[PDB]
Amino acid sequence: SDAPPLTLEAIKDRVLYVLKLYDKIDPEKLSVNSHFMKDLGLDSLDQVEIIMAMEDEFGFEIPDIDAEKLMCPQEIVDYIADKKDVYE
Amino acid sequence: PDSWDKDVYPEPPRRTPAPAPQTSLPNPVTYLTKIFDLLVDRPVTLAREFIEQQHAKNRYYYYHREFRRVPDITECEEKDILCMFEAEMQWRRDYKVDQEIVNIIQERLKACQQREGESYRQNCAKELEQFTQVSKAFQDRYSDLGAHYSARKCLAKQKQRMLAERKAAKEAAAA
Amino acid sequence: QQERDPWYDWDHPDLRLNWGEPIHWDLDMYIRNRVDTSPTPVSWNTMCKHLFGFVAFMLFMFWVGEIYPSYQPVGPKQYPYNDLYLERGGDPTKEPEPVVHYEI
Amino acid sequence: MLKIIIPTTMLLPMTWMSKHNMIWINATVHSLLISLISLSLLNQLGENSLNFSLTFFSDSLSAPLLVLTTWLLPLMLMASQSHLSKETTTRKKLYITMLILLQLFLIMTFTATELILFYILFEATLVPTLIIITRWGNQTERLNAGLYFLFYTLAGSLPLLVALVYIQNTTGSLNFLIIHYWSHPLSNSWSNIFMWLACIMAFMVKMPLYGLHLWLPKAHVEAPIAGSMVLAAVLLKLGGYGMMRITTILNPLTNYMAYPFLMLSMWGMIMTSSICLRQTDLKSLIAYSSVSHMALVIVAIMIQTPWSFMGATALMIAHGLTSSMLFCLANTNYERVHSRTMILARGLQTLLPLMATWWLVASLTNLALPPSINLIGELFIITASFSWSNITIILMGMNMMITALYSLYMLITTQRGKYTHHINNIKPSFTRENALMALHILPLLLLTLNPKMILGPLY
Amino acid sequence: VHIEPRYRQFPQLTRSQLIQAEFFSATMWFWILWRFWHDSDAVLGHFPYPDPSQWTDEELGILPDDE
Amino acid sequence: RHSIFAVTHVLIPVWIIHYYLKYHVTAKPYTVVERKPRIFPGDTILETGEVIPLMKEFPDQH
Amino acid sequence: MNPFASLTLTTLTILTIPIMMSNSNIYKTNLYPNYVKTTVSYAFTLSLVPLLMFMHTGQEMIISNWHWMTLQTVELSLSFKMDYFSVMFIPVALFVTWSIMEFSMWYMHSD
Amino acid sequence: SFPKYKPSRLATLPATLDPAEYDISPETRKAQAERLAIRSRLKREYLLQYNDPNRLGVIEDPALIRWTYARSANIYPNFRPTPKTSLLGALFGIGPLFFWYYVFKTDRDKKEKLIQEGKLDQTFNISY
Amino acid sequence: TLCLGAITTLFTALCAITQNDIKKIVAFSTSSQLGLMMVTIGINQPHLAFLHICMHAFFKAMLFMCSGSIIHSLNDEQDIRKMGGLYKAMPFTTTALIIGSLALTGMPYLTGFYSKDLIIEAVNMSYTNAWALLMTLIATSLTAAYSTRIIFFAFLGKPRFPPLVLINENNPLLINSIKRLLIGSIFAGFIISNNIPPMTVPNTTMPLYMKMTALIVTIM
Amino acid sequence: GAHLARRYLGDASKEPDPLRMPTFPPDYGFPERKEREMVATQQEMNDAQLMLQQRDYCAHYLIQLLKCKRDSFPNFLACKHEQHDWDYCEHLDYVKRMKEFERERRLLQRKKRREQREAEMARG
Amino acid sequence: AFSAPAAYLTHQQKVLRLYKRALRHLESWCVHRDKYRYFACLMRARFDEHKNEKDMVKATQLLRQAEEEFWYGQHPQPYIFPESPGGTSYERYECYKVPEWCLDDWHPSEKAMYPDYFAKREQWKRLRRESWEREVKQLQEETPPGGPRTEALPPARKEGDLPPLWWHIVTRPRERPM
Ligand SMILES: CCCCCCCCCCCCCCCCC[C@@H](O)O[C@H](CO[C@H](O)CCCCCCCCCCCCCCC)COP(=O)(O)OCC[N+](C)(C)C
Ligand SMILES: CCCCCCCC/C=C/CCCCCCCC(=O)OC[C@H](COP(=O)(O)OCCN)OC(=O)CCCCCCC/C=C/CCCCCCCC
Ligand SMILES: CCCCCCCCCCCC(=O)SCCNC(=O)CCNC(=O)[C@H](O)C(C)(C)COP(=O)(O)O
């Protein structure tokens, strides 16, 4: 039929996967609760690039006003779940 | 069929070619024609036969109404209301008859153009002349009367036309 | 209404309005099913100039081509029976002047 | 034809003697029966009219108008009983009495043999309409609307009366048959010019003509639903019927007195079609639509050709049905949301799909979709005008465009888009409303099937 | 026919679709080649185009610049 | 149940249309008009039996 | 009686049957798209026959079957022209429509 | 450096290209804060009634009523006969009528004059 | 009519070669073909115009179905900038679209050849406007141009769609419909042209260079 | 194409005009010319109902091709020889038209040059 | 869409939005992935070249010049995601969204089907009815006397409170309702 029912576990897996392919982030040092600003030592432009990578991964655009606030992979997973009405 | 007069609605004598096969292949048109005949034309014919048999057991007739001729608007006094009423009714009936005549001629023209095919411009010349003549007569009779037309207005138009043609004839005579 | 921010949670998402704010006098003209005033990548009166120039050039060139036609180096088509006099309208009681075509 | 007149005067005491909870049922049933009885009048001759007696006669032009009136009365009864639930019994009986009197007045008006009796009934129709508008309307504007409805008519109709009696002092009679048979040309004098104006201006106001139309939006917006139905469907057609009757004695003056009226009609057709594009009120859009269609009918009657007369009759009938249906459709939404603003309730197709279908059919019929009798009338008038002058097809063409636009605009503004979030009192459509729209629409297509019944005597 | 998503790998392909695609491409090319072999005139033209410069005056009947 | 579709959707409408054209539309003149068939040299007419002569001894530019 | 006219009218008339069945207990099920596609394919196969007749002979007809109304001298009737253009475009349009409907049975499944 | 973009009535100036936004002052910030506060107050007032369980019907919008009343019933009281108003009214209400009258009168006079001379080719012109 | 057709076909072909929505490109191709049809009417060849209508129906409808198959495959995505290497992922769709583009461009002995080739040869040998002839030639070059654009951006190169691969065309309905329209777009030209009577006078004598004009401009 | 460039850039006085052509008598340069003949009578061409534009001097081959096509209906690939013959007759007609155009061009240029030479001689 | 807007945008926010728009339009211009990566690295270098300017006047001047350059060199037909405000599926499914209160008008025969669903609906309605007054009282206490100054809303703080004005946000129809 159409696309399978995207689940929270799949969203977290994809977010972590795309994050672990970024050269400026160590794979092992990354956790689902890692902060991009404090823990990771990235600047604002790196956050913008990560947000665009998320959009390209999931095929939909995140508005800027909602995009600036996201700072950890858990926030990204929650935002994608709420936008897509994923409950399981 | 005999439903309509074949003189009012004339037709050519319907010449058609005989079929001359030239290939050993079968003609699917003939096979489909046979299938259509055997599957459609026979049950339809039987139903029609039954319906006509039922109709024949109860035969009654309707008649065409005949109207006599009454004095025209010319033979009517200025205020004789009854004679004017009768003349006006007669005029309206004649107007309807003339309209139907023009319609018949138009039907002749339309049928002929289609029937002729690619030679209609030459073949249909006879129909075209008849339509032109009847159209000219109809236009001289009833055109430009407008709404609220009557026998008096048609009479006035005719009188004006005859006055004009009499003047033209008298002026041409002196030439 | 097209120029308004599409990512804001408007009270009326379709009309892009909020409850209580003043309504433009010509709102029904600007309902975004209608006249749009949003900025364009190419400025006005530059699109106008290009479009008018294209249309005027095409019209003038078509006129020129009409006055300077293209054709093959051939004579006119020849038809056997007096240019098919009887075929294009008949009139068989007029004795039309004979048209004759010769070999070449 | 007292077989139609007397049953209505019997509807009067039957309504005034019925039980408190059976007024609507009895009135609707017997008005439907009277409409069925009146259906027999469509059997018209090809030469003359049905001359029943010295006082009443029926022609092929007035018979469809009588049938439409008798068909409209039960529809008005069905549309009125929703908003009249809280009224007292006596006031409901008075409302039904006013509607019955209006129908009786119209029935005698469309069949009077003399011009004076026709004038008397044509002016008597004012009182029930004024009472209804000024008493059962909703807002405070109704009073002003009533005044605009009344004097606009009388200032145009009072001179006509004088003209009428003057004619009887000259010709000796005002019977339509004697008038038609003893017609004489009108000379070229100032006296004859002013007689022409006196005979024409009343019906010009009743259509209404552009520039004389300012009473119509007020009257048709501020009146109750049955008032709006009867004003748009039948009362506008009195002017057209009267002009058709009276133009028999005005020739050949009309040949040059029709110019300013023709120019006003065409340009005002364009102007009102343009006004309909920018309207914040849903009822005013339908009112200005009515003005445009009546301008078309005015042009048709003025050019005075058999094709134009046929198109005028067809367009009159079709517009009556169409405008009544559109008014009912708007009234349903008004009863749901208690506001006439068009952009207030949007996306109604999601919540009311069958009502969306009714809206679609009404709008398609409004823009003259073939082969509806709307298009038949419009196209006949267009061809007659083209014969009158080849340039007319420009203006008519513009209208033929603009109309469609605003029609679809209305539809897309109300049925499409997304629903208004804060409006949550939109209940499913009742059977009464669906039956009302169905009874409005089915006769339109049925008459499309047999279009010779509404093409007038010139057919 | 059940095919699952792949996530950055080549999609799963069934033999039927490749067979159909190859057959139809081959039949298009066969038809083109066959028709070109048997109906070449429709591409290269059928009759030679004559050169008016190589027509003598005897057949064109133009007088030799005297009369 | 298997091929009832071809009966209730093809056979019945064609029966009704054949009836209506054969006995009602044809009953009035000029309702069904067909263009005349093409006649070529070497043909024989079905009704009259007349044969059409050949074509004027071709030049035979072989 | 010259099956050209009957087949040409039947091709047009059988396309309207699902429109009348739209208020029946087939519009409320999930078999309606298949029913419509089958109807259009049957119509195409029926229309393939008058094309063959024209190709063999060259038959052209006009059928003025219903007389709608008549003006003073202009008569309006329901007439169909079944010349070369009609009998050639109808099968092609029906074929394309059949293919498009079968494609839509897959494209618009989630609608 | 690059070609300039000049806005029009039907193609306005982009927000990022507006000079008046790149030169800001504290009073501009105060104005923006006041605008946001007004908008937030209106939004809260709307949302209180929007989420009310006991609310059944349509929340009246005074803005819509004001717009409709201004567009319809407030026009005549605020009308004054001025040279501009009088000139526009006379032009747009009289000029089209006389223009079309001249056009149609000229067309019909030419047609009638041709008719009198007997050269209009009215053959087959039965219906009118 | 001829001038209107020429301007329409040229303008639409010129607008098509830069579009990024595949549906918009096919729409502009349809408009250009309609302009060519109007040009054919303008030179007194209505039967050729009808034949072109019948010919173009097939491959235009099948091209739109192929585009729709691609769109439904990649989660309702219509931009060609985000459709990558589908030559091997969608073999049947690729085959069908290649055949349809070849037929549209007047490839010899296919469906679109038997109408468009005759149209070009008929406008070449007519007493006609020279500007219209030039615009018809430029438009028939731009036709091949935009077909090349579609094929190159949609079916060649590396993938550019989102990584969650949902490509699947193994459905009997889609395959059957496209196969029917494909058989049509391969053979209908020959079948119809050989089975209709000659309603036109043919152009038998033509210069060799003018005969290959359409082929030359298409290849360029 | 070259004739177009010759007429539209060079001397158009000696170039033929397709609308006004021929401007010379048909028997001017020729001593005797055979009247072009027809093989199909008007009646046969009418019964065949070819077209008004197909009734040229090559109508007989078209008539035979149409007759064979009607006779050989189910085999739509058997009408090749007569189609070739009709194509050949049309090609001959086109060649004759080209010959007429060349004749007119040569006659026009020769006549104009000869008149110019006569005027120059008389002016000396 | 979910977050309340502020009174104004900061300079850093403007620069970040310009960066995102420039990268997206450059990707629109550079179709292929490797080319996009190359010129994206170049654009990032251009952006972080002036990252350390202490003069805000010159920073705003550079932002102005960059905006002008972007407007001149923008793609006339940029790539838009299918469900973005300019996309080909932006408001596609808005016609399939029906508010929940419509279920209140269902016939009893219709509600006879799905009994458990309507039992849960009754539970949710009771929850809303009990929580309304507490939400109203919380809104009044938190808000400053001079009216609210932002569109933000406070969360729940007490034992069993709910965030005020939650019903219409929580009971959204769906993103793919039908
Ligand atoms: C908001 C819209 C309201 C409705 C409008 C109703 C339209 C009514 C207009 C009446 C139509 C014409 C009236 C008279 C017919 C001719 C008018 C005049 O222009 O024609 C010339 C008239 O010449 C001059 O105009 C003299 C008349 C001048 C006095 C009339 C006043 C004109 C000023 C405009 C006032 C606006 C009137 C409406 C007020 C509301 C012809 O010259 P002449 O051949 O000798 O007269 C013919 C009559 N004969 C044969 C008996 C001799
Ligand atoms: C013959 C008399 C009339 C001739 C026409 C003259 C011009 C008519 C002008 C009509 C004005 C109508 C105003 C209200 C219409 C409704 C509002 C409306 O349509 O909105 C505009 C809407 C939105 O624009 P989009 O680009 O789709 O944006 C969507 C993405 N955001 O688009 C439109 O519909 C605009 C249509 C107006 C076209 C007017 C210009 C056409 C001129 C054609 C003249 C050429 C004649 C051709 C001759 C052919 C040779 C014989
Ligand atoms: C495809 C066509 C369009 C391309 C045209 C566009 C090209 C424009 C290129 C030039 C743009 C610039 O350099 S504009 C450079 C502007 N200069 C400054 O901002 C200096 C002060 N520094 C800061 O504001 C922050 O450190 C900040 C830099 C935001 C980092 O933010 P974070 O670290 O906290 O995330």
Tokens of G107: 């494209």
Chain K interface disruption, residue of C7, C36, C38, C50, most K CBs within 10 A: C7
Residues D386 and D345: beta-carbon distance below 8 Å: no
Instruction: Estimate the crossing angle of helix I130-155 against helix I91-104, to 10 degrees.
Output: 170
Determine the length of chain J: 124
Experimental determination technique: cryo-EM
End-to-end, the C-alpha distance of chain H in Å comes to: 69
Tell whether ligand 3 has an atom less than 6 A from the beta carbon of residue K51: yes
Residue A29 lies in a domain: yes
The tokens describing B42, both together, are 């026979």
Q: Phi and psi of K77, rounded to 5°?
A: -130, 75
Residue type present at position D136: W
Per-position DSSP letters for J39-51, written without gaps between them = SS-HHHHHHHT--
Cβ-defined contact of K72 to H44 (cutoff 8 Å): no
Of E64, E53, E51, E62, the C-alpha closest to J106 is E62
* Amino acid (1-letter code) at residue I89: A
State whether residue B17 is helix, strand or coil. Answer: strand
Distances (CA, A) of I4 to H61, I11, K15: 52, 11, 50
Cα–Cα distance for residue pair D371/C90, rounded to 1 Å: 40
Query: How many Cβ atoms sit within 10 Å of the Cβ of residue C88?
Result: 12
Number of domains in chain A: 1
> What is d(CA K28, CA K47) in angstroms, rounded to the nearest whole number?
19
Residues D37, D43, D48, D51: what is their CA dihedral angle, to the nearest 10 degrees? -20
Distance of CA I207 to the CA centre of its chain: 26
CA distance I86 to I93: 9
Strands G61-70 and G75-81: antiparallel
CA atoms within 13 A on the CB side of F20: 16
Tell whether ligand 3 has an atom less than 6 A from the beta carbon of residue K46: yes
H40: exposed, middle or buried (Cβ count in 10 Å: 0-12, 13-18, 19+): buried
Pairwise CA distance, residues D45 & D57, whole Å: 13
Pairing of strands F32-34, G61-70: antiparallel
* Chain Cα centroid distance, residue B115: 18
Q: What are the tokens at J42?
A: 């008007």
Question: Residue I128 in 3-state DSSP?
Answer: strand
C11, HSE (Cβ side, Cα atoms, 13 Å): 23
Among K33, K80, K88, select the one facing I158 at the smallest CB separation.
Answer: K33
CB-CB contact of D88 with D144 (8 Å): no
The two three-digit tokens of residue K35, written as one number: 């080319």
For ligand 1, what atom is nearest to the CA of residue D261? Answer: 7
Residues of C with CB under 8 A from a CB of D: 11-15, 19, 28-29, 31, 33
Q: Judge: C90–B121 Cβ closer than 8 Å, yes or no.
A: yes
E8: region left, alpha or beta (phi > 0 left; psi from -120 to 50 alpha): left
Residue B104, number of CB atoms within 10 A of its CB: 15
Q: Is F21 left (phi over 0), alpha (psi -120 to 50) or beta?
A: alpha
Q: Looking at beta carbons, which residues of chain I come within 8 Å of C57?
A: none
* Long-range pairs, D376-380, Cβ under 8 A, ≥24: D376/D311, D376/D314, D376/D318, D376/D451, D377/D310, D377/D311, D377/D312, D377/D313, D377/D314, D377/D315, D377/D316, D377/D317, D377/D318, D378/D296, D378/D311, D378/D315, D379/D311, D380/D300, D380/D307, D380/D308, D380/D310, D380/D311, D380/D314
Q: Report CA(K15)–ligand 3 centroid distance (Å).
A: 5
Stretch (H or E) spanning F34: strand F32-34
CB contact under 8 A, J44 and F41: yes
Residue pair H58/D422 in contact (Cβ under 8 Å)? The answer is yes
Query: How far is residue D148's CA from residue K42's CA, in Å, rounded to a whole number?
Result: 75
Contact predicate I194/I111, CB 8 Å: no
- Note whether I178 and I97 are within 8 A (CB): no
Which residue(s) pair with G64 in the sheet?
G79
Rounded to a whole number, what is the distance in angstroms from the first to the last CA of chain G?
46
Distance (Å) from the C-alpha of residue B114 to the closest C-alpha of chain C? 16
| Residues ≥6 apart with Cβ < 8 Å to F42 | B20, F51, F52, F54, J67
The token duo for D163 is 């003209």
| Atom 2, ligand 2: residue with shortest CA distance | D398
Say how far apart CA F52 and CA I186 lie, in whole Å.
42
Distance, in Å, from the CA atom of D132 to the CA atom of D135, rounded to the nearest integer, reads 5
CA distance to B113, C4, C33, C102, per residue, from D413 (Å): 51, 20, 10, 74
Helix or strand run (H / E) with residue G78:
strand G75-81
Mark whether G and F touch (3+ CB pairs within 8 Å): yes
Q: Write out chain B residues lying below 8 Å of D59, CB-based.
A: none
CB contact residues (below 8 A), chain D span 306-365, against chain K: 349-351
- Ligand 1 nearest atom to the CA of residue D204, by list position: 4
Nearest ligand 1 atom to the CA of D257 is 11
Q: Strands of D39-196 (E only): list them.
A: 50-51, 57-58
Tracing tokens 């009188």 back to the chain, one arrives at B159
Residue matched to tokens 């067809």:
D314
Q: Does A1 fall in a domain? A: no
Does residue D203 contact residue D196 with C-beta atoms inside 8 Å? Answer: no
Contacts across the B-D interface (CB distance below 8 Å): 31
| Sheet with F32-34, side-by-side order of all strands | F32-34, G61-70, G75-81
Nearest CA-CA distance, residue G67 and chain D, Å = 11
For chain G, where are the alpha helices, taking DSSP H only? 4-13, 17-21, 32-56, 84-107
- Using DSSP, state whether D224 is helix, strand or coil: coil
Taking CB atoms and an 8 Å cutoff, what residues of chain D touch K90?
Answer: none
Neighbours of J41 (CB within 10 A): 17
**Which ligand 3 atom is at minimum distance from the Cα of A48?**
35
Residue of A2, A43, A64, A85 marked active site: A43
The answer to whether the beta carbons of residues D431 and D350 sit under 8 Å apart is: no
What backbone phi and psi angles, to 5 degrees, belong to C103?
A: -70, 160
What residue ranges line ligand 1, CB within 6 angstroms? Answer: D 188-190, 193, 211-212, 260
Which ligand has the minimum distance to the alpha carbon of residue I7? 2
Tell how far CA J33 is from the center of its chain: 15
Q: Residue B161 in contact with residue J92, Cβ under 8 Å? A: no
Instruction: For residue B121, give the chain C residue with the closest CA.
Output: C89
Partners of G75 in the β-ladder: G70
β D57-58/D50-51 pair status: antiparallel
- Please report residues of B whose CB lies closer than 8 A to that of H123: 132, 135-136
Rounded Cα gap, residues H68 and D281, in angstroms: 8
CATH code of A19's domain = 1.10.1200.10
I139 within 8 A of I217, measured Cβ to Cβ: no
Distance CA D59, CA D42 (A): 9
Site of tokens 């149940």? F1
A3 within some domain: no
Cα gap D67→D110, rounded to integer Å: 11
User: Would you give the distance in Å from CA I140 to the centre of its chain?
Assistant: 10
**Which residues from chain E sit within 8 angstroms of residue C104, using beta carbons?**
59-60
Place of tokens 């008859």: B97
Inform me whether the C-beta atom of residue G74 falls under 8 Å from chain D C-beta atoms: no
- Cβ contact (<8 Å) for B143 and H124? no
Residue A69 belongs to some domain of the structure: yes
Host domain of residue A50: 8-84
Chain K positions in Cβ-Cβ contact with residue A85 (cut-off 8 Å): 172, 174-176
- Give the residue carrying structure tokens 């539309």: F25
Helix (H, G, I), strand (E, B) or coil at J9: helix
Q: Nearest Cα to D385, choosing from D372, D400, D371, D370? A: D400
Q: What angle do CA J109, J111, J112 make, to 5 degrees?
A: 65
Q: Rounded to an integer, what distance in angstroms lies between the CA atom of residue D210 and that of residue D395?
A: 15
A 10 A CB-CB count for D61 gives: 23
Q: How many Cβ atoms from other residues are within 10 Å of residue G10's Cβ? A: 25
Taking the CA of residue C66 and the nearest CA in chain H, the distance in Å comes to: 31
Q: Quick check: E35 and I169 CB within 8 A?
A: no
CA distance G80 to G62: 6
Q: Specify which residues F45 forms β-bridges with.
A: B17
The strand pairing partners of C70, in sequence order, are: I128
Query: For the stretch B54-91, what's the b/e string if a residue is b when 16 or more beta carbons lie within 10 angstroms of its beta carbon?
Result: eeeeeeeeeeeeeeeeeeebeebeeeeeebbebbbbbb
CA gap C54, C71 in Å, rounded: 27
Q: Is A43 a catalytic residue?
A: yes
Residue A52 lies in a domain: yes
Contact call for residues D64 and D310 (beta carbons, < 8 A): no
Partner chains of J (3+ C-beta pairs under 8 Å):
B, C, E, F, G, I
Assigned domain for A2 exists: no
Interior/surface letters J96-112, b for 16+ CB within 10 angstroms, e for the rest:
bbbbbbbbbbbbbbbbe
- Inter-axis angle of helices D373-388 and D306-337, nearest 10: 140
Nearest atom of ligand 1 to the alpha carbon of D256 = 15
CA distance D31 to D100: 9
Task: Give dist(CA D443, CA G71) in Å, integer.
Answer: 22
The answer to whether B147 contacts D180, with C-beta atoms less than 8 Å apart, is no
- How far apart CA J63 and CA J70 sit, in angstroms, is 11
- Residue D130: closest CA among D3, D215, D21, D246: D215
Is the CB–ligand 3 distance for residue K134 below 6 Å?
Answer: no
Rounded to 5°, angle at Cα K38 from K32 and K44? 125
Strand partners, F51: F44
- Distance of alpha carbon A44 from its chain centroid, rounded? 15
Instruction: Give the Cα separation of D23 and D73 in Å (integer).
Output: 14
What's the rounded Cα separation, in Å, for the pair D63 and D35?
Answer: 12
Using CB atoms within 10 Å of the CB of residue E44, give its burial: 0 to 12 exposed, 13 to 18 middle, 19+ buried. exposed
A3 contacts in chain G (CB < 8 Å):
none
Q: Please give the structure tokens belonging to residue J21.
A: 């052509």
Structure tokens at K50: 């002036």
What is the distance in angstroms between the Cα of K15 and the nearest Cα belonging to chain A? Answer: 9
Looking at D81-140, list the stretches that DSSP marks H as alpha helix, in order from N- to C-terminal side.
89-109, 115-124, 126-136
Q: Phi and psi of D298, rounded to 5°?
A: -60, -45
Cα gap A79→A56, rounded to integer Å: 15
Pocket test for ligand 1, best of D152, D186, D190 (most atoms within 8 A of CB): D190
Please report which residue ranges of chain H form alpha helices under DSSP H: 19-22, 26-50, 62-72, 83-116
CB B147 within 8 A of CB D458: yes
Q: Which are the contacts of D339, defined by CB distance < 8 A and separation ≥ 6? A: H58
How close are the terminal C-alpha atoms of chain I, in Å? Answer: 28
Of H13, H43, H71, the CB nearest to C18: H43
**Orientation angle between helical segments D282-303 and D373-388, nearest 10 degrees:** 50
Q: Would you say the CB of residue K10 lies under 6 angstroms from ligand 3?
A: no
Kindly provide the resolution of this structure in angstroms, with one decimal: 3.0
Would you give the distance in Å from CA D213 to the centre of its chain? 14
Closest-approaching ligand to the CA atom of A37: 3
3-state secondary structure of D4: helix
Beta-bridged to residue E8, according to DSSP, are none
Those residues of chain I whose CB sits closer than 8 Å to some CB in chain C are 3, 6-7, 125-133
Q: CA-CA distance, H16 to K71, in Å (whole number)?
A: 9
- What would the 3-class secondary structure string for chain E be? CCCCCCCCCCCCCCHHHHHHHHHHHHHHHHHHHHHHHHCCHHHHCCCCCCCHHHCCHHHHCCCCCCC
What is the C-alpha separation between D304 and D293, in angstroms, rounded?
17
Q: A77 in a domain, yes or no?
A: yes
Residue D22's Cβ-count burial label (10 Å; 0-12, 13-18, 19+) is exposed
Cβ contact (<8 Å) for D280 and H72?
Answer: yes
Q: Which run of H or E residues covers position A81?
A: helix A73-83
